[PDB]
């Protein structure tokens, strides 16, 4: 994915138009930046099981961007030229999509779609194209039913994943009676609920976590 | 057009010492390193050596270190392998590459030694 | 030193079948491996560097694979032009290593 990345994109042309000179000769410098961009825009393509490192989102690609340009700092500062110039040039693409890939693996191993429940919507960027798209987490929007019990403050609705979902405006939440009918207590983005001086009127509820063009986020039943 | 025209067959004596040029053309050879190849029809290839007239700095094959000197003329793109304390196992071709995204070659110096 | 050998001193072919050259490294090369052909008289051509990353002067009908250890490369749609002798060399360590040839003869 890091042919997405302008500081890349912009690294890659000072390479070519300053730091080649120092290390071969004029009339391979096209050839040479030919096999460098072919072995960069490989970063991420999900070829073949490896298809988790299709995607990443905005924080790794910048691991992955200043993992790069360290290593191509590396290359300009030495003055290593010949033969050794491109075998050690090419063991760094080579060592950075391994770097890359770990990226990725751990992306998808504790990021990606971390919801125990409910729909979440991730920011990623597809390697292949640079096309960044609205992903979508989906499990079932019931997440079960809590039994609060409180005369004489009242309501937990905040998911720990909800501060890193996208598209979430505000919560609202209603209370559902035996008529099976819903009256909206409160709608803000405070992600919980505190109402002085119960009472023994107030003995179900049902929250309710709203996107923008996703539909409702979660959803989380109450038996005070 | 990148081009390396090294130096004419040489014959000589055993014991004899030996300095066969190459002249490289299509680029400045300070901007590269150049190596030089023996080969024999019974023994294959052997690496000799590198050096980037550059810096004037040359690594070899341990087992020639004694045998050759790849020196080089920056100013005239030059390099040249000096062979020393010549002897019959010595009778081979001698190749000069440019290596560096690439490698051109000679067309190959004889070098035949024999008394 | 690093011994690359080519079991098959040069094989047989035939003037259309793919043809496949192999050298096995004494030691890991790990990917330092090129691939040089040379016509008799004249001197070798660079043909791929790396183990798969081919010049440009090259026809696309050559190739090369192998890791580690063990190397091969493959002629995919052989012609008469083709037929010479193959060099594999190991490049990884010094000193640099050439092992031995192959001559793409055909067969009668």
């Known amino acids: 994915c890091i042919k997405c990345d302008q500081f890349v994109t912009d690294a890659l042309k000072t390479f070519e138009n300053t730091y080649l000179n120092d290390h071969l000769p004029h009339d391979i410098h096209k050839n040479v930046m030919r096999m460098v961009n072919h072995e960069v825009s490989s970063f991420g393509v999900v070829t073949s099981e490896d298809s988790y490192l299709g995607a990443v989102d905005e924080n790794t690609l910048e691991q992955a961007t200043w993992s790069f340009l360290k290593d191509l700092k590396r290359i300009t500062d030495s003055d290593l030229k010949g033969e050794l110039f491109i075998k050690e040039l090419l063991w760094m693409l080579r060592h950075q999509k391994d770097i890359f890939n770990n990226l990725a693996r751990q992306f998808q191993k504790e990021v990606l779609c971390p919801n125990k429940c409910g729909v979440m919507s991730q920011t990623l960027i597809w390697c292949l194209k640079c096309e960044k798209q609205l992903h979508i987490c989906r499990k079932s929007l019931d997440c079960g039913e809590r039994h609060i019990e409180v005369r004489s403050d009242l309501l937990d609705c905040l998911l720990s994943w909800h501060r890193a979902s996208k598209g979430l405006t505000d919560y609202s939440f209603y209370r559902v009676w035996e008529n099976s009918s819903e009256t909206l207590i409160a709608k803000g983005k405070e992600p919980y609920l505190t109402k002085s001086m119960v009472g023994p009127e107030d003995a179900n509820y049902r929250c309710v976590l709203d996107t923008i063009n996703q539909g409702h986020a979660t959803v989380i039943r109450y038996d005070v | 057009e990148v081009q390396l025209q090294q130096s004419g067959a040489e014959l000589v004596k055993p014991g004899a010492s030996v300095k066969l040029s190459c002249t490289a053309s299509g680029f400045n050879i300070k901007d590269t390193y150049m190596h030089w190849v023996k080969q024999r029809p019974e023994q294959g290839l052997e690496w000799i050596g590198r050096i980037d007239p550059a810096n004037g700095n040359s690594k070899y094959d341990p087992k020639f270190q004694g045998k050759a000197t790849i020196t080089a003329d920056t100013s005239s793109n030059t390099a040249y392998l000096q062979l020393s304390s010549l002897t019959s196992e010595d009778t081979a071709v001698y190749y000069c590459?440019?290596?560096?995204?690439?490698?051109?070659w000679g067309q190959g110096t004889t070098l035949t030694v024999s008394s | 030193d690093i011994v690359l050998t080519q079991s098959q001193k040069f094989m047989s072919t035939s003037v259309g079948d793919r043809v496949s050259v192999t050298c096995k490294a004494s030691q890991n090369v790990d990917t330092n491996v090129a691939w040089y052909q040379q016509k008799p008289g004249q001197s070798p051509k660079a043909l791929i560097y790396?183990?798969?990353y081919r010049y440009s002067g090259v026809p696309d009908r050559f190739t090369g694979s192998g890791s580690g250890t063990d190397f091969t490369l493959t002629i995919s749609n052989v012609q008469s032009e083709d037929l010479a002798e193959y060099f594999c060399?190991?490049?990884?360590?010094?000193?640099?290593?050439f092992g031995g040839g192959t001559k793409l003869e055909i067969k009668a």
């Open positions: 060399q190991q490049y990884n360590s010094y000193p640099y290593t």
């Open positions: 790396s183990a798969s």
């Open positions: 590459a440019r290596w560096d995204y690439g490698v051109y």
